[PDB]
C-alpha cells in the first residue's frame, strides 16, 4: 500500500509573489557530507544540497563548477 | 518584513505552511503564513532548516494511502 | 543493536525512511533504513524528533500535483 503526498496544483503567481529570489543564492561550498555538498546561502542558511541539485539555485551551477575543479585538482 | 534569518528556529513565529509547488526547474517552493499574518515564499530548502516540523504537519495532512 | 532513543538527533545515523503506513487505528509508521544496514519501525511522532529531514526527503520523493 504505497503512500503518497497529494497536493493540489496552484498558479505559481499565487507564490511568488511573495518570494525573495535571493535568498539562496549560494556563496560557498563549506564542506562534503557523502554524495552531498554543505552550501552557504546569501540569506545566511546553511544546507546540504545534492550535487545534481545545485544548479536549481542561483550560483550553485557556477559554484560547482569550481568546486569540481579544485577537488580534481585541476585547480 | 523580512523574513527573520537572525533566528535560528521559525518554528514558533509560523502559523502554517499555506501550499508547496513545484517551479519549472523542478526545484520545490512553500509559501508560509506567519503568525503575524504576513505571508512569504521560500524554496523547500529554507523551510527544512528554519521549521521543518511545520512542513511535516502539512505534508502529513495530504498523505493518502493506495 | 537498538536504537540510541536518548540521542536528541538521528539524522546523521540513518539512511533514509523507506515507507509510511497507517496502521488501523490511525497511527502514522515509518520504516527507516540506518546507515549501517540494519531496519527499524518507529511511530511518525518519534521520527519528526529525530530525524525530520529524514522524513521530508521521503515525503517529497513523493509528492503528487494533481
Redesign the interface.
Given at each position: 500500500?504505497?503512500?503518497?503526498?497529494?497536493?493540489?496544483?496552484?498558479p505559481?503567481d499565487?507564490?511568488?509573489?511573495?518570494?525573495?529570489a535571493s535568498?539562496?543564492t549560494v556563496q560557498k561550498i563549506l564542506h562534503e557530507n557523502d554524495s552531498t555538498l554543505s552550501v552557504k546561502?546569501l540569506?545566511?542558511?546553511?544546507?546540504l544540497?545534492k550535487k545534481d541539485?545545485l544548479?536549481?539555485?542561483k550560483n550553485g551551477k557556477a559554484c560547482l563548477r569550481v568546486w569540481l575543479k579544485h577537488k580534481s585538482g585541476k585547480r | 518584513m523580512?523574513?527573520p534569518?537572525?533566528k535560528k528556529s521559525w518554528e514558533d513565529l509560523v502559523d502554517c505552511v499555506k501550499?508547496?509547488?513545484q517551479?519549472d526547474?523542478?526545484?520545490l517552493?512553500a509559501?508560509i503564513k506567519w503568525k503575524n499574518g504576513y505571508?512569504?515564499?521560500?524554496?523547500n530548502?529554507?523551510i527544512?532548516?528554519?521549521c521543518p516540523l511545520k512542513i511535516i504537519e502539512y505534508?502529513e495532512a495530504?498523505?493518502?494511502?493506495?
Open positions: 500500500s504505497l503512500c503518497k503526498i497529494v497536493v493540489r496544483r496552484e505559481l499565487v507564490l511568488l509573489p511573495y518570494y525573495d535568498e539562496t546561502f540569506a545566511g542558511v546553511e544546507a544540497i541539485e544548479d536549481k539555485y | 523580512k523574513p534569518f537572525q501550499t508547496v509547488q517551479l526547474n523542478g526545484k517552493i509559501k505571508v512569504s515564499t521560500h524554496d530548502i529554507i527544512h532548516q528554519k505534508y495530504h498523505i493518502k494511502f493506495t
